[PDB]
Amino acid sequence: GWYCFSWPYRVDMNRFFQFYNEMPLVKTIAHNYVIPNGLNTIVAYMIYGGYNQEDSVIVSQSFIDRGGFAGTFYREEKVELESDIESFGKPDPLITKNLKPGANYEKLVDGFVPVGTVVKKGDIIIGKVAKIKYIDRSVMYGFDEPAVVDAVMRPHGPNDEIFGLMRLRYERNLNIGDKMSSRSGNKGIAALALPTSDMPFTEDGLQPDLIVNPHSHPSRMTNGQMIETTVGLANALQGVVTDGTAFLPINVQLLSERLAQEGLRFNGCQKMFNGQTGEYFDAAIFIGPTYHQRLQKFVLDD
Amino acid sequence: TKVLLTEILLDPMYDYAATVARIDGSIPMHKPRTPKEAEYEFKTVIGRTPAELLSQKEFYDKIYTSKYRPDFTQLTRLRDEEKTSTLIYLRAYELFLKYLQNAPNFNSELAEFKTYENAYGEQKALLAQQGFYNIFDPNTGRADQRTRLFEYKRLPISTLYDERGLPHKWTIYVYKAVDSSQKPAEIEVTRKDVIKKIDNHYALADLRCSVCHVLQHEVGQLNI
Amino acid sequence: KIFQNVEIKPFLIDFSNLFIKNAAKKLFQLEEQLPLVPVNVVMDFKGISRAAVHGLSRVLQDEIPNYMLDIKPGGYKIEDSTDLFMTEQFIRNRINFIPIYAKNETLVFALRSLNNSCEVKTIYSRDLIQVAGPKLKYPIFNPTFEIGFLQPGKSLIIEDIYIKKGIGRKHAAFNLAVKTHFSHLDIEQYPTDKKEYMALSGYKQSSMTSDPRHHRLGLCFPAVPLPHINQAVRTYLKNACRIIIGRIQSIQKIYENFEEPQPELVLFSMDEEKTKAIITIKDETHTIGNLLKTYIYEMIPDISFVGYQCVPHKQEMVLTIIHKASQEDLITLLEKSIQNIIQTFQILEKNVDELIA
Amino acid sequence: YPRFALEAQAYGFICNSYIAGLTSPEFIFGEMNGRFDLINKALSTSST
Amino acid sequence: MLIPVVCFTCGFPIGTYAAIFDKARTEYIKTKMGGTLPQNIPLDASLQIELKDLITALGIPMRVCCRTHLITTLDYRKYY
Amino acid sequence: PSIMRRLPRKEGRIRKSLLGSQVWSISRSTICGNSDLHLDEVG
Amino acid sequence: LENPKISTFQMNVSACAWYNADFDGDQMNLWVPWSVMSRVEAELLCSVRNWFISTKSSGPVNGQVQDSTVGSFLLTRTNTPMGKNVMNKLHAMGLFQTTQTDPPCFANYSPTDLLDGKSVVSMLLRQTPINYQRAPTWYSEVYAPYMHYNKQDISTQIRNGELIEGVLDKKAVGAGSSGGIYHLISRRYGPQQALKMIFATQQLALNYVRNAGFTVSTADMLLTPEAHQEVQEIINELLLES
Ligand SMILES: [Mg+2]
Ligand SMILES: [Zn+2]
Ligand SMILES: [Zn+2]
């Protein structure tokens, strides 16, 4: 989510700023005091090819491309000096010793890689040589995914000695292996991403963002997630946001009759078609907006 | 010179003063690209040359001071809302500068502007409302209180015991034929025999006790 | 007449609502409709298989070449863009998904936003100035998009905003049509309001048995000029047809070279006078596979087997045909099926020309 | 609940279903039972 | 940080009506708010704020996804 | 620091260096579902 | 996996029973043998076909889980809310287009001929003909008074690979089911052939649900007003006895 409102002024490590956040269609009193973190993803509770079994989910690739659960991930590089021995600068091959093999010292400018350039594995991001003629105490970018240098500064430490501070940013979309969860505690791993023409669609054109297995419900009894979809389905059409705080009086029988008052079915299920073949299922499918949140467990980091 | 510049360029006060200087055009809207631009921006924002800064012992006395001095006495609530935002911004910067300088009679002005900004934040909170809805009970005119919760009720003791005092054992399933022409009209079976004697031509009507031989729905005919 | 009874209606702003009227007048000085409006098109097809109609729908959705706005590398001017919250990823994602109706790939735009005030300033798409290409006689996008916002005293400079071409299945910014309706008009339906039918789809025939040949398909196009709506929609339809034909023609180029050893086609002579053919086309989707399977099956009712499996992690379409004829007869029937597909979509294009006047 | 309460609800009898929702005392008793599932799961790794 | 340019689900151009839908919405709430502090609007328990006809007047269709993402998206300008 | 403290515990010499081992030529990643793979296949 | 965007280790869901794994965030190690000696030993000893049968319990480890257990039931079910559970030639052929086996012969079928799920399953089990006769998990004395069981669904019988009658569910095709379909195939044709049939039958089950559909909704959990009154009459009798 918006992990901090002053993020651009910070050089933080392993911090993720998700761009788009939504208030739940079924909110609670907890959202009067903290910012909501997530999106009101359309979820279909169906079997679609067996790719959402054993707590996996199927994600729409179009939903990913549009910025769903996308954000920027930040890392930090703080390097310190030895007073009057070490310095920041680009080394030279014909003097300095034990340079790292296969390293790219050519991206440095005055010892620091300039802000805005893409650093890949084996690139030297901070140049540092100790005077013996010289020994190369450099810092090499040892990460698989390339980053972009976001901020470079030379602040003064508690001892009034220079150290180098660098902020590296990563453009993190949702991708296969990333973890998502509902507000009922039903987490899952993105297993398959389908194009917008392969996802199932209803007779009225509605298609899901996530497809979750119906077999995640019966053994876990996360009934608040199914009631949220039923309530939120009529909230969207009525143009309202309601409160679903715990222990407030609810009547699922009356919430279901609320669906029929808005032109839907009692059960909230709709006639859907297979997007790959165009053939309708012989069963109405329960599809509606369920608030889902992206957990900060990135497969690119693990 | 370099250590002073590095110390001050990382001061949040410096970026705030630079923003105020950019707002009224005293310095270019872009960051310095050359040593001359950086020196000019420092001279304008801090109010002293970096070499001249060492020379003395003051630092906050000559930091930028916004050019337009609007009237903040209309912040007394009195094309106004954008003007209100402008006044809030300028008053906040001016009080920040006053706090840095320990200017006399600051706490009272600070509390006054805190009240002003609380009102302004109330307006912004009004702007930041998505809406809210309550499902009303039609019988009443307020939030629905109808629930499907359990409601305790002392049942008659005849629902557990018969007129001879023995407990009920609902173990005989009674099936009635859906179609009138179907015969026999009723079949009474036990759980192990349902698959052997009942088809879709019959429907489960009621249970029966295996002790007093009464239908469950006719248990209220027992003398309590 | 396979395709008849089209109806076209735009999505317009209701200015009889006082709140909408006042907001539009105060924000953009907007008094009438925007230059580009969404257009809903509902089409009736008769005597045509579900495979062809759904393939047309899929192609119109995310398999037709389409234009978007993108930022060339280095276009985001870091030295000049002082705003800390409007990052390149955010603004680029915003700009990529503005629906444009472009005329050529030569237009280049720029965004030069300066905030000289004490209040946050919103950057709208009306601040996208055209800097290269012939002068526009009509806008290619609406001016009411919230591109971003600048904090007081901040800037945002982006150069080299160009028009990029692609298909939506690669990036969703190239998607064209959104589904609004799909139904079969030759299958009866239940009243699904009743609690005894609400768990079923509604059709009185099972999808495992039904073979509908009369369909209604409704698609919405996100940005079409107001005075040329009929000219735009028609073009789109025709374009889709051609696209499908092209891809089918590519497979026609495979079967024509079955004597030469070719990697996209494998022919086997099995037992019982049976011939097997496996066609592996890389980077093909369920559209062409379903079309091929359906038309081969229609051409050969007594075929031993036909299937078109498309595995997501292999990124290719594999069509298997097992038939009791010789290799030459099988190839002949294959070109016959491909010719039937081509003729069907040519008839569709002619009907598109005949309907949308 | 009072001291020496005799009703069954005071000792963990939950009269409601999940679809109807639990009251505050029922949710507390349910949380007591559900905490053991988490404790025994964490113990089933180290003890085993 | 803003209402998305297109619907996250289907890609209908929601953004072209976002700004207007912002201002109008606020005006509508000002009619229904009633003797209650703004930050207490999600707690009033007597409010019936429905934006169905307001969104319909913009030409946005009756799609669940589009109206969901238009209604529910948070605005960074309003929290910072 | 002592010679005989290197031995005893889980992080000691015997359990960490001898009974277990850091190895090369190995990979780790989050696992995922794929219904097109055979039971004896790994993506 | 040639897609550069994929960073996960992907495996079939029926292979999760070996590792006690699932897809909620588990991470697994993978090393590829490079030496000839270790690469011979991986094939001959450590192949996962060598542990289809559990050494702990002497029973099968793998089977259908959660989509092919209910998918097999729906496919082999005798009747459907749409009437008889049959499919035409085109849709019957479509169940075999993902199994990656040799496709069966449908030449003796008109386009309008109807095939049921027992015929389609039999076309797959003919390659490994086994004999099986047990009552399915679907039949329970617990539900019998309140449900009308079909007499063709409560007795699963396979002789020489032909599914004569009954539905396939956890009893016959489930993971860990001793004496099940895959346990019998392993004892007669080997654990590697049993693994092929777990995959092939999983594709039939999933391709049936590909246009049969399977969902769960909130109304599936809702008692009728008359039935809710009956439940709290039952609870009130418990509190009366208390
Ligand atoms: Mg796990
Ligand atoms: Zn009795
Ligand atoms: Zn939408």
From TrEMBL, chain A:
<comment type="function">
    <text>DNA-dependent RNA polymerase catalyzes the transcription of DNA into RNA using the four ribonucleoside triphosphates as substrates.</text>
</comment>
<feature type="domain" description="DNA-directed RNA polymerase subunit 2 hybrid-binding">
    <location>
        <begin position="1"/>
        <end position="302"/>
    </location>
</feature>
<comment type="similarity">
    <text>Belongs to the RNA polymerase beta chain family.</text>
</comment>
<comment type="function">
    <text>Catalytic component of the DNA-directed RNA polymerase (RNAP) that catalyzes the transcription in the cytoplasm of viral DNA into RNA using the four ribonucleoside triphosphates as substrates. Forms the polymerase active center together with RPB1. Part of the core element with the central large cleft, the clamp element that moves to open and close the cleft and the jaws that are thought to grab the incoming DNA template.</text>
</comment>
<protein>
    <recommendedName>
        <fullName>DNA-directed RNA polymerase subunit beta</fullName>
    </recommendedName>
</protein>
TrEMBL record, chain B:
<protein>
    <submittedName>
        <fullName>M1249L</fullName>
    </submittedName>
</protein>
From TrEMBL, chain C:
<protein>
    <recommendedName>
        <fullName>DNA-directed RNA polymerase RPB3-11 homolog</fullName>
    </recommendedName>
</protein>
<keyword id="KW-0804">Transcription</keyword>
<dbReference type="GO" id="GO:0000428">
    <property type="term" value="C:DNA-directed RNA polymerase complex"/>
</dbReference>
<dbReference type="GO" id="GO:0006351">
    <property type="term" value="P:DNA-templated transcription"/>
</dbReference>
<keyword id="KW-0946">Virion</keyword>
<comment type="similarity">
    <text>In the N-terminal section; belongs to the archaeal RpoD/eukaryotic RPB3 RNA polymerase subunit family.</text>
</comment>
<feature type="domain" description="DNA-directed RNA polymerase RBP11-like dimerisation">
    <location>
        <begin position="277"/>
        <end position="350"/>
    </location>
</feature>
<comment type="function">
    <text>Component of the DNA-directed RNA polymerase (RNAP) that catalyzes the transcription in the cytoplasm of viral DNA into RNA using the four ribonucleoside triphosphates as substrates.</text>
</comment>
<dbReference type="Pfam" id="PF13656">
    <property type="entry name" value="RNA_pol_L_2"/>
</dbReference>
<dbReference type="InterPro" id="IPR036643">
    <property type="entry name" value="RNApol_insert_sf"/>
</dbReference>
<dbReference type="InterPro" id="IPR036603">
    <property type="entry name" value="RBP11-like"/>
</dbReference>
<dbReference type="InterPro" id="IPR009025">
    <property type="entry name" value="RBP11-like_dimer"/>
</dbReference>
TrEMBL record, chain G:
<comment type="function">
    <text>Catalytic component of the DNA-directed RNA polymerase (RNAP) that catalyzes the transcription in the cytoplasm of viral DNA into RNA using the four ribonucleoside triphosphates as substrates. Forms the polymerase active center together with RPB2. Part of the core element with the central large cleft, the clamp element that moves to open and close the cleft and the jaws that are thought to grab the incoming DNA template.</text>
</comment>
<comment type="function">
    <text>DNA-dependent RNA polymerase catalyzes the transcription of DNA into RNA using the four ribonucleoside triphosphates as substrates.</text>
</comment>
<comment type="similarity">
    <text>Belongs to the RNA polymerase beta' chain family.</text>
</comment>
<comment type="subunit">
    <text>Part of the viral DNA-directed RNA polymerase that consists of 8 polII-like subunits (RPB1, RPB2, RPB3, RPB5, RPB6, RPB7, RPB9, RPB10), a capping enzyme and a termination factor.</text>
</comment>
<protein>
    <recommendedName>
        <fullName>DNA-directed RNA polymerase subunit</fullName>
    </recommendedName>
</protein>
